[PDB]
């Protein structure tokens, strides 16, 4: 999946799901590619979470490069279904932007630091 630019360890993906849930429950998130893209463009996203199994994939393919342009970190999770569950909706979500982490503050910081590690190693 060409828009999936680097591998993510399974336990970090779990942290990402849990960060989305906690931010949704106690903070503010955006759901879906249109509001995720706007939050990134506007510099409001603290962390973007992108599902690896979106089909058709075109709706998410621009997000990683846009995040990079805006210096906003992103991470991947395998399952749009699980990402939607975390985002508090009844169906799959392609992407989420965490705006206000709330009680997800620690997880978000942990995820950002760990993705920095992954990307330094991968060189992407």
Domain boundaries, the chain: 1-124
Q: Which residues contact 12 (CB under 8 A, 6 or more apart)?
A: 75, 111, 114, 115, 118
**Resolution at which this structure was determined, Å:** 1.6
Query: At residue 94, what are phi and psi to the nearest 5 degrees?
Result: -80, -35
**CATH code of the domain made up of 1-124:** 3.30.1330.30
* Calpha distance 95→35 (Å, rounded): 9
How was this model experimentally determined?
Answer: X-ray
Contacts of 95 (CB under 8 A, 6+ apart): 31, 32, 33, 36, 48, 49, 50, 51, 60, 63, 83
The helix, strand and coil proportions of the chain, stated in percent and rounded to the nearest 5, come to 50, 15, 30
Convert 3-22 to b/e letters by CB count within 10 Å (16 or more is b): bbeeebeeebbebbbebbbb
In angstroms, what CA-CA distances link 26 with 16, 50, 60, 99?
A: 15, 20, 26, 11
Query: Going by C-beta distance under 8 Å and a sequence separation of 6 or more, which residues neighbour residue 82?
Result: 17
Q: Are 66 and 41 in contact (CB under 8 A)?
A: yes
């Amino acid at each position: 999946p060409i828009y999936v630019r680097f591998e993510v360890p399974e336990d970090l993906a779990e942290k990402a799901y849990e960060a989305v849930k906690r931010a949704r429950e106690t903070g503010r998130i955006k759901k879906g590619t249109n509001e995720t893209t706007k939050a990134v463009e506007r510099g409001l996203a603290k962390l973007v979470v992108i599902a690896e199994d979106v089909d058709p994939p075109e709706i998410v393919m621009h997000l990683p490069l846009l995040c990079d342009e805006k210096k906003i970190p992103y991470v991947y999770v395998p399952s749009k279904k699980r990402l939607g569950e975390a985002a508090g909706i009844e169906v799959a979500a392609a992407s989420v932007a965490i705006i206000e982490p709330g009680d997800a503050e620690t997880l978000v910081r942990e995820i950002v630091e760990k993705v920095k590690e992954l990307r330094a190693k991968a060189g992407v």
